[PDB]
Design a protein around this ligand. Structure first.
Ligand SMILES: CC1=C(C(=O)Nc2ccc3n[nH]cc3c2)[C@H](c2ccc(F)cc2)NC(=O)N1
Lengths: 339, 62, 625
């Protein structure tokens, strides 16, 4: 029967892929990097403490200008902060309280948030008379919005608990392309620096590479024993790191089509909420549910430093484009800045 | 359940299976090389003076 | 002292509150005096589509009250011409084909009931229902309705609400007082029963029943029965607020006037009949019918009073033997013998005799024998004195008939039968009802007409359903007294605060354009030991509860995740809410009124429950290990 046969031969293709992968595992990254000098201890301290949100912070993002950064909280608002002075450029009350994610556009002219409303709302920061309207409400997902990132002011990519991601046209409102394949709630994405590719991570504990323009999935990365909550590209766009409920982070290379490195200790049991890379790719920053952010050596997998002033979960983080700083965001209602 | 949807799985697995992969050693070396090449322009990695740091003792901005 | 209305902000909570009870409908609102008055102030004054539809309604109402035909024929020409024929010529009549024709037929035939316009009533109402209703709800007339409703629903009377005067009756288990309700200045009677002096006689049932009975009857405004507007108690007494009758009882007047002529008795009979009609329409036989239980107002008009021994035959008929001896019908006295209204006809019969002749008919030689006054009632036609007219006789004949087969009132159409008695040929019962007949007796101006015992837990439980307010009476009280003058002051006060905010700048309410479920004023508690209760404006969202004081944004909140339980609790005897929080912490809130408390509870419980089932499903939001 044909229904049997197509399952049979998907099983056989799966093996073809595992084998093809092992044929390239001629060495590991640890072997390769055994030589270079360690990073020493990375010692950052809280520079700024950003105070304002009245409940948990669930997400944050920095502007390309390395200074303003937007955040979303269970207090049903976004705040756009100037990190330099701690001042609030804007304070946006949202129409739905159940917000989970946010973004700052490349230009810094728009921001975007969503949540259980199942909509990506785009907020024009810079209006006809210095106000802040909702400019658009992108509706079409049939489940909660989990992440979103602008490619530029006219397009954007989203990820959803309906297990798909999507490409939208902002002027028209349209769901241009959709990206199916994941069998569970998609939880995060990251755009490659060249914006022709993004990866998603999901509650199926697979993670996937997609071509924007073609609408297809090129590659699928398994290995985690549990939900992948977070994901970020290595700055050269040839690899990415994931963070998961299994208390590990992992580094996957694209061209070798497989994992290269796991990041972990027996001393760390909680799940990872978030991840970023220092400007060089050399450090891997991760936020944990035990309240701390761990700073890992990306190349040697050792554990270099810890950022630890937070009385609840670190739920999100990011590093500036200029590399000067790291923002951490917490369930304890504050963002801190680290440098 | 669906025949359409199994046909579709397999065609996807074919895309995934017919890519050009490279040696992991080459892959990892290419990465190590990235990190050295930019190690000097990464503030978290190297210690910069206050006068190049927006956040330390600094008062004055736009 | 006076009635203060809750702020307009109260609308958020009452509207959900009424909505939960289906009470936000044209039907339910239109048929309440204050709802009515607010709807009409809206339509007539602030909405041009709606004005006519209501003037038309109103004119018809004045037309149902027109007394004659000659009054009628006239007005129903103007009403046609004005509110219809004008429209017809301009194509614009928003009514049926049938309706319109159904009126014009009764005109060209000059045969004009008081209902002509009834096909129109229905349709004015269809025309007002739905769409027009909708704008009224959006208007601040419905906000005003919510303010009066809030006061209604928060009534908790005590002696103190009353300015209490001379005693105007003593009897049974207490006393009656003239009194004035401070709020509105309304004069009332206050019948006060001593709970103890009750237990002593295991009389509790009777005390309760009066209350139950009063409530079946006190709707409709009957002019010929003493009716109730509130009931409340204290730990020692029960109180009924009642129609004021400071004119004394017949039993007493009789003893001072001496016997009445047929003419003078006809007057009382007629009012009394009509009272009985009312009660009998609601399946209540009065049973203790007699001069002492008929009362005079200041002008000499009369009301049936004291419904203790009265009872309901709606579902099941009494057969028991209660009344005053010398006025009980046969079927009553006989145990094992069921009955309905009938006894009251007999008792009427008995009573009227008494007003003519100074004694009960079955009480000759001033006897007391209780068993033999009963004998004379069974097989025995009563001999009616030589001085009684032919028509009086046929009446009493009808009313005293040993058998109910053949008694007047018990042959199919109640009341009506007795009204057709040619004893009353001379009278017009519409005019009786309007109290237009001069009464024969005008009370001159005043009338005068042990304890080892304890009170347990399980005594006061008998009284737990006793307090009560009658919406219809309260609205009526208010509508005739302070409503216009309060709406006025209130209007002015709100437009100060609002027009002053046009200066200050508290100018773009925080709930608008979000997902707020409810908002309003509550008082949270800071330090117990300082009677610190800080009053804040709270907004409830689907996943938190924000609040603030004057001037600021909200500085503080509580999330629905954090809330474990919500309970009612007692503090220095006002009811508060107790939210227990996850840190083993607490959070107390006092509401300003019953419905506000009732609602804040239903919504807090709903919201914390849903939000927790929600977050549970969202991987990023839930608590993991
Ligand atoms: C009908 C009757 C009494 C009575 O009910 N009097 C009333 C009752 C209601 C009244 N409203 N305004 C004056 C009133 C006077 C008076 C009475 C009854 C019960 C009481 F608790 C107090 C007074 N004594 C009596 O023999 N018969």
């Amino acid at each position: 029967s044909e229904l049997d046969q197509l399952r049979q031969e998907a099983e056989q293709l799966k093996n073809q892929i595992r084998d093809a992968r092992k044929a390239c595992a001629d060495a590991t990254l640890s072997q390769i990097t055994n030589n270079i000098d360690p990073v020493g201890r990375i010692q950052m301290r809280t520079r700024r403490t950003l105070r304002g949100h009245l409940a948990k912070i669930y997400a944050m993002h920095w502007g390309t200008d390395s200074r303003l950064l937007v955040s979303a909280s269970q207090d049903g608002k976004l705040i756009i902060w100037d990190s330099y002075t701690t001042n609030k450029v804007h304070a946006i009350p949202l129409r739905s309280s159940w917000v989970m994610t946010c973004a700052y556009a490349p230009s810094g002219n728009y921001v975007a948030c969503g949540g259980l409303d199942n909509i990506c709302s785009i907020y024009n920061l810079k209006t006809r008379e210095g106000n802040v309207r909702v400019s658009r409400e992108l509706a079409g997902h049939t489940g909660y919005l989990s992440c979103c990132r602008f490619l530029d002011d006219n397009q954007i990519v989203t990820s959803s608990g309906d297990t798909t991601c999507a490409l939208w046209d902002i002027e028209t409102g349209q769901q241009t392309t959709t990206f199916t394949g994941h069998t569970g709630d998609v939880m995060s994405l990251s755009l490659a620096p060249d914006t022709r590719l993004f990866v998603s991570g999901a509650c199926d504990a697979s993670a996937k590479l997609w071509d924007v323009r073609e609408g297809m999935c090129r590659q699928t990365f398994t290995g985690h024993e549990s939900d992948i909550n977070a994901i970020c590209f290595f700055p050269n766009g040839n690899a990415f790191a994931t963070g998961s409920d299994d208390a590990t982070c992992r580094l996957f290379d694209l061209r070798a089509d497989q994992e290269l490195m796991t990041y972990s200790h027996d001393n760390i049991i909680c799940g990872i909420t978030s991840v970023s890379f220092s400007k060089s790719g050399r450090l891997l920053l991760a936020g944990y549910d035990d309240f701390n952010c761990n700073v890992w050596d990306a190349l040697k997998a050792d554990r270099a430093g810890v950022l630890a002033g937070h009385d609840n979960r670190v739920s999100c983080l990011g590093v500036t484009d200029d590399g000067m700083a790291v923002a951490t965001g917490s369930w304890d209602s504050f963002l801190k800045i680290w440098n | 359940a669906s025949i359409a949807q199994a046909r579709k799985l397999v065609e996807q697995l074919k895309m995934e299976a017919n890519i050009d992969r490279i040696k992991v050693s080459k892959a990892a070396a290419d990465l190590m090389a990235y990190c050295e090449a930019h190690a000097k322009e990464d503030p978290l990695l190297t210690p910069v003076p206050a006068s190049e740091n927006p956040f330390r003792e600094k008062k004055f901005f736009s | 002292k006076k009635i203060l209305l809750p702020e307009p902000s109260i609308r958020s909570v009452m509207q959900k509150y009424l909505e939960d009870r289906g009470e936000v409908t044209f039907e339910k609102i239109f048929s309440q005096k204050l709802g009515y008055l607010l709807f009409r102030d809206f339509c007539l004054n602030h909405l041009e589509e709606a004005r006519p539809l209501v003037e038309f309604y109103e004119e018809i109402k004045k037309y149902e009250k027109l007394e004659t035909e000659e009054e009628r024929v006239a007005r129903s020409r103007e009403i046609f011409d004005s509110y219809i024929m004008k429209e017809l010529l301009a194509c614009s009549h928003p009514f049926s084909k049938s309706a319109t024709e159904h009126v014009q037929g009764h005109l060209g035939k000059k045969q004009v009931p008081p209902d002509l316009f009834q096909p129109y009533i229905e349709e004015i109402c269809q025309n007002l229902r739905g769409d027009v209703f909708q704008k009224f709800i959006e208007s601040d007339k419905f906000t005003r309705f919510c303010q009066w409703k809030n006061v209604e629903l928060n009534i908790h009377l005590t002696m103190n609400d009353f300015s209490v005067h001379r005693i105007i009756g003593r009897g049974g288990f207490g006393e009656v007082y003239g009194c004035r309700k401070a709020d509105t200045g309304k004069m009332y009677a206050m019948k006060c029963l001593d709970k103890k002096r009750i237990k002593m006689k295991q009389g509790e049932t009777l005390a309760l029943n009066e209350r139950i009975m009063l409530s079946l009857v006190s709707t409709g405004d009957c002019p010929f029965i003493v009716c109730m507007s509130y009931a409340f108690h204290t730990p020692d007494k029960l109180s009924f607020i009642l129609d004021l009758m400071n004119g004394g009882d017949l039993h007493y007047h009789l003893s001072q006037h001496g016997v009445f002529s047929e003419a003078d008795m006809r007057f009382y009979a007629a009012e009394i009949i009509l009272g009985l009609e009312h009660m009998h329409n609601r399946f209540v036989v009065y049973r203790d019918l007699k001069p002492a239980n008929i009362l005079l107002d200041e002008h000499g008009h009369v009301r049936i009073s004291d419904l203790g021994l009265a009872c309901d035959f709606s579902k099941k008929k009494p057969h028991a033997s209660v009344g005053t001896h010398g006025y009980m019908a046969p079927e009553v006295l006989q145990k094992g013998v069921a009955y309905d209204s009938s006894a009251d006809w007999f008792s009427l019969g008995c009573m009227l005799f008494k007003l003519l002749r100074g004694h009960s008919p079955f009480r000759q030689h001033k006897t007391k024998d209780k068993h033999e006054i009963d004998r004379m009632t069974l097989t025995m036609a009563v001999e009616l004195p030589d001085s009684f007219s032919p028509e009086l006789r046929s009446l009493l004949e009808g009313l005293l008939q040993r058998d109910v087969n053949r008694r007047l009132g018990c042959l199919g159409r109640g009341a009506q039968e007795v009204k057709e008695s040619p004893f009353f040929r001379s009278l017009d019962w519409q005019m009786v009802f309007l109290q237009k007949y001069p009464p024969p007796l005008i009370p001159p101006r005043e009338v005068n007409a042990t304890k080892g015992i304890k009170l347990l837990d399980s005594d006061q439980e008998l009284y737990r359903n006793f307090p009560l307010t009658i919406s219809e009476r309260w609205q009526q009280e208010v509508a005739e007294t302070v409503f216009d003058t309060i709406n006025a002051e209130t209007d002015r006060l709100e437009a100060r605060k609002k027009a002053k905010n046009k200066q200050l700048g508290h100018e773009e309410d925080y709930a608008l354009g979000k997902d707020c479920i409810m908002h309003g004023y509550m008082s949270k508690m800071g330090n117990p030991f300082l009677t610190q209760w800080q009053r804040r404006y709270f907004y409830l969202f689907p996943n938190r509860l924000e609040w603030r004081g004057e001037g600021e944004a909200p500085q503080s909140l509580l999330t629905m995740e954090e809330i474990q339980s919500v309970e009612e609790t007692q503090i220095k005897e006002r009811k508060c809410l107790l939210l227990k929080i996850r840190g083993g912490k607490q959070f107390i809130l006092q509401c300003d009124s019953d419905p506000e408390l009732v609602q804040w509870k239903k919504e807090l419980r709903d919201a914390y429950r849903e939000a927790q089932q929600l977050v549970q499903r969202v991987p990023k939001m839930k608590n993991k290990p």
